[PDB]
Ligand binder design. Structure first.
Ligand SMILES: N[C@@H](CCC(=O)O)C(=O)O
Ligand SMILES: N[C@@H](CCC(=O)O)C(=O)O
Ligand SMILES: [Cl-]
Lengths: 250, 248
């Protein structure tokens, strides 16, 4: 049977392809992760059906009831066979689902405007005039929520107390906030690179705050995890992932 | 106790300097030894460090399929873990298991400053400046297998001059860059260490590829996923970053 592949809209990894005519099935989608999925299928010999995650979330565990949401929950429940998306490999996720080895490496950083006095997370933490936030229920939010580092702990205190006003539903919403208000957005460096190649007034501020990879997610125990790792290693070595990066980040 | 295979390579693993003779695990220090210590704390194992007898990382013989180096030790179940700057590669992942990466890197070029050489392509299209890599490591294996024109050409050069331009260790390659007209293909993490200590040397060009170092285990080992979890803990705690800062 075809594998069910959960994913999420996120430029330039996954987007709706443009056409003057209606599009159907997998042909509706394009992006770096869609190219990745196609190449994985070429190597491993599977067929697949792409399905956008219904709640539009990456995945986090609820504080109170300990339930997961997003693509992570879809894998846990065996509603999908793979998640092919910019899904960060994290400690808490690795406890409940499996991941291939990373196809891309990245870290949290800051998206803000050029020409300002802000040069680091510490600069943001030490003030309140410039608001800042992150995507709700993603790995970046979770990093701040759990950090014992003073600077990041202070930042979580600020974001948490202003949740409704500074946390956003999507990277797109965050980027828009940066473009239209005095706001700095905590987000992943890979995605910042895409944004700053298109928006010449924006820049990454400071360096990477952490390091992590994106991996293909599978339900815990899936035999596809190790096969997908081997295929990713092949695509990396052949230079195909690099060409895909160049294609989509232009 | 676990048997841990490793290899001498600054600043990942080195012999501690000391006045008094050292024994057993006390003999060793470095980034990978700190990593091993952190992993043993999280997972609750004790261990014996043993340097790989043949001094090799691991490659497969093109004729008879035999492996050497730390990879061989894992295949033969002579070691439980390999904790070293051991690159996760396609060919190795088919025969051993690896944790997720504790460090990310890529092949690049080590050479002297002040020249017009700016890329692998610049090296490939000439012969005056010789170039090479560590024998029986991941970098050599990348070139050997590459379908990319420039890299295929570089493999043709290197293999035809194997006895002169391929070296036994990074240390030997670095000395060769310092004493002759030679550019060394080597891993970017190690280049960073070298260029922070040798102001006449520099990385040429960017990364030629992308890979990680992982803890190796025999195929099917229960330790692989446990070590991955521990590495993720260490990354998220900020310890992997502090470990790199310490040794670099
Ligand atoms: N890629 C992230 C979502 C975006 C973010 O948290 O910055 C994740 O896997 O949760
Ligand atoms: N770290 C490499 C050895 C050095 C190199 O090939 O540049 C390996 O795992 O084989
Ligand atoms: Cl893995």
């Amino acid at each position: 049977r075809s594998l069910i592949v959960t994913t999420i809209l996120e430029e330039p990894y996954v987007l709706f392809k443009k056409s003057d005519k209606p599009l159907y099935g997998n042909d509706r989608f394009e992006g770096y992760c869609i190219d990745l999925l196609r190449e994985l299928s070429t190597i491993l010999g599977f067929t697949y059906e792409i399905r956008l995650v219904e709640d539009g979330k990456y995945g986090a565990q609820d504080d109170v009831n300990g339930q997961w949401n997003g693509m992570v929950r879809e894998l846990i429940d065996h509603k999908a066979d793979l998640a092919v998306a910019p899904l960060a490999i994290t400690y808490v996720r690795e406890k409940v689902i499996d991941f291939s080895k990373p196809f891309m490496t990245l870290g949290i950083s800051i998206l803000y405007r050029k020409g300002t006095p802000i040069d680091s997370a510490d600069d943001l933490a030490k003030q309140t005039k410039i608001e800042y936030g992150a995507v709700e229920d993603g790995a970046t939010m979770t990093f701040f929520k759990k950090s014992k580092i003073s600077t990041y702990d202070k930042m979580w205190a600020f974001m948490s107390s202003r949740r409704q006003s500074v946390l956003v539903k999507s990277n797109e919403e965050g980027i828009q906030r940066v473009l239209t208000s005095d706001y700095a957005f905590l987000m992943e460096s890979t995605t910042i690179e895409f944004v700053t190649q298109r928006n010449c007034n924006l820049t990454q501020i400071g360096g990477l705050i952490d390091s992590k990879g994106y991996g293909v997610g599978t339900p815990k125990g899936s035999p596809y995890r190790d096969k997908i790792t081997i295929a990713i290693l092949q695509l990396q070595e052949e230079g195909k992932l690099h060409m895909m990066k160049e294609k989509w980040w232009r």
